[PDB]
C-alpha cells in the first residue's frame with residue numbers, strides 16, 4: 105500500500121537476516137515448522153551452556169489447555185547456564201577493553217566509560233560482598249531500588265552470578281510501594297543508593313528506603329541494606345552498610361574471582377511487580393534459560409545489532425524494557441550502550457541528541473510519550489545535534505500514531521533510519537511483533553510481523569475462535585515461546601485465570617487488527633489497566649489510594665485521552681457532607697496518591713461529583729458513563745436506565761466542561 109515505508113538500502117545490506125522481506129519469511133517459516141530445532145540452533149550458536157539440553161528436537165514441553173491439566177511451559181530443561189557468565193565472563197579476555205556502558209549522570213559533568221573488563225571486576229566484588237557479608241544464597245530474593253547508574257547493572261549481574269532472585273523496584277515508587285514489594289517478595293536484602301537527581305528534582309533513595317524498611321520491620325521482617333555512593337544519610341547501625349565499607353572487607357582475591365552458580369534452565373531469575381486489571385500488582389516470574397535466549401535473540405534481530413553499533417535505550421530498569429533491553433539482552437550480545445541517569449530536558453531538550461552525537465549512537469530505543477514531548481518542544485533542540493550515525497530507531501510501550509512515527513524517522517533520524525515499533529509485554533519477556541531493520545517494509549503505526557517462533561492470532565470476542573485473514577478482535581498467542589513468564593509469584597491460579605482463560609492460547613489483554621499483509625495493529629488494552637506515559641497502572645490501585653484521604657467518601661478512576669501521556673488519569677470523587685473544597689484539598693488528595701504509590705500515579709484531573717457517582721440500584725458504579733464524560737464524548741454516554749440516581753449525569757457533564765480537562 106501507499107503507506108508502506110521501505111527499509112533503507114544500507115540497512116538491508118547490513119541485516120543479519122537479509123535485504124528483502126523474503127529473507128525474513130524464510131527464517132520465520134522454519135522457526136514455526138521446526139520450532140524446537142530453530143531454538144536449539146540459536147541457543148547453541150549464541151550462548152554458553154555448562155550443560156546442554158539432551159534433544160534438539162524437543163527443547164520445550166508445555167500445556168496451554170487447562171482441560172488437560174495445569175498450565176505450564178519449560179524450555180531447555182536439563183541445560184545448565186548462568187546469565188552473568190553469558191553477559192560478562194564469556195566476553196573476556198577478548199573484549200576486556202570494549203566499552204560496555206558510556207555512562208552519563210543527570211549532571212553532564214558526570215561521565216564514565218565502563219569497559220567489559222571493569223564490569224567484571226565490579227560484579228565479582230559485589231557478588232562476593234553478597235555471598236560472604238550478606239549470606240545471599242541461591243534462590244534468595246534481593247530488592248533493588250536504584251537509579252540508572254553502572255552499579256544498577258552491576259547489582260543485577262552479581263545477583264545473577266550467584267543465583268539470587270532480584271526484584272527491581274522502580275526508583276519513582278514511594279516508600280509504601282517499595283515496602284509492599286519487599287514484603288511480598290520476602291527479600292533478605294535491599295540494595296539502594298544514597299540519592300539521585302532528575303533534572304532539578306532531588307531523588308531521595310536511601311531516605312525513602314528508611315521508611316520502607318521501618319514498615320517492613322514493624323511487620324516482623326528483617327531486611328539488611330547495602331547503599332551505593334552515588335551523589336551523609338542516617339545509616340542504621342547493624343542494618344545499613346556503605347558499599348565502600350563492604351568492599352574494604354573483601355580480600356584481594358575477592359576483587360578478582362567469584363565462583364559462578366551454575367543454574368538449571370527453570371531456576372527463577374527475577375520477579376517483576378506489574379499492575380493488572382484488578383487488585384494489587386502481581387509479581388511476574390521469569391526463569392533463566394528461555395528468558396536469556398529470548399531477550400537476547402530479540403535484541404539482536406529487532407534492532408539488527410552488530411558489534412560496530414552503539415546502542416541507547418532510554419528505559420528504566422524498574423520496568424521490563426530495562427531488564428531485557430538495557431541490561432540483560434544487550435550485554436549478552438556484547439553491546440556497547442549508553443547508560444543515562446538523567447532526563448531528556450536537562451540541561452535542556454537537546455540532551456538526548458547530545459548523547460547521540462557524543463557516543464555515535466546508531467540504535468535508539470525509546471517511548472512514544474518521550475517522542476511526543478520532544479515534538480512539542482521544537483525541532484531546533486534536535487537539529488543542533490549530529491544524527492548521522494543513527495540507522496535504527498525503536499519504539500516501545502504504547503501505540504504511536506503516524507505523525508509521531510514520521511517525526512521520529514524523518515526529523516529525529518533525518519530520513520535515514522528504519523523504525524522498529526515493538527509490541528510485547530512484561531509477561532512475554534521480549535519482543536513479540538516487530539519490524540526488523542533492512543528486511544521489513546514498515547507501515548507507520550503497525551508493529552508489522554511476528555518475531556521468529558511467535559504465532560499470534562486474532563480471537564473473536566464472542567466465539568473465542570481464531571479468525572483468518574483480515575480480522576479485528578482479541579490478540580492472543582497460540583503456541584509457546586522461550587521468553588514467556590512462567591507464573592505469578594505465589595499465585596499460579598491467578599496466572600491461569602488471567603492469561604489462559606481460553607484453552608490453547610496465551611491471552612494478551614490487548615485488542616488488535618491484522619491486515620491483508622498479515623501486519624498487526626495493536627489498538628490498546630481491553631481491560632481496566634491504564635497506560636500512562638508507557639507505564640501500566642490499575643485504576644483500582646489509584647482508587648484505593650484516593651479513598652485513604654480522610655475527607656474522601658468514594659472515588660472512581662478512569663483513563664482519558666492525553667496528547668502527551670497517551671492516557672491520563674481522571675479521578676471522579678465525592679467528599680463527606682459539608683467539606684469546603686479548595687485547590688489545596690484537591691492537592692492533598694493528589695499528594696496522598698503520590699505517597700501511597702508514587703508520582704507516576706498522579707491524577708491529571710480531579711472532578712468533584714457534587715451529588716455522588718452514578719450507581720446502579722445494587723450500588724455498582726457505572727464506569728462507562730465516567731469514561732465517556734472524561735473523554736468529552738457526551739453523545740455516547742449510553743444507557744442511564746439502570747442508574748439509581750440518574751439526576752447526577754447533568755452535573756457530571758457540566759463540571760467536566762467547566763474544568764474542560
Ligand SMILES: Nc1ncnc2c1ncn2[C@@H]1O[C@H](COP(=O)(O)O)[C@@H](O)[C@H]1O
Pocket residue numbers: 378423424499500501502503504525526527528529530531551612613614626627628629635638639640
Ligand atoms: N508497540 C506497542 N504498541 C501498542 N501498545 C503497546 C506496545 N508495546 C506495549 N504496548 C502496551 O503496553 C502493554 C505492556 O506493558 P508492559 O507490561 O509495561 O510492557 C501492552 O499490553 C500494550 O497495552
Ligand SMILES: [Cl-]
Pocket residue numbers: 380381382602
Ligand atoms: Cl488481573
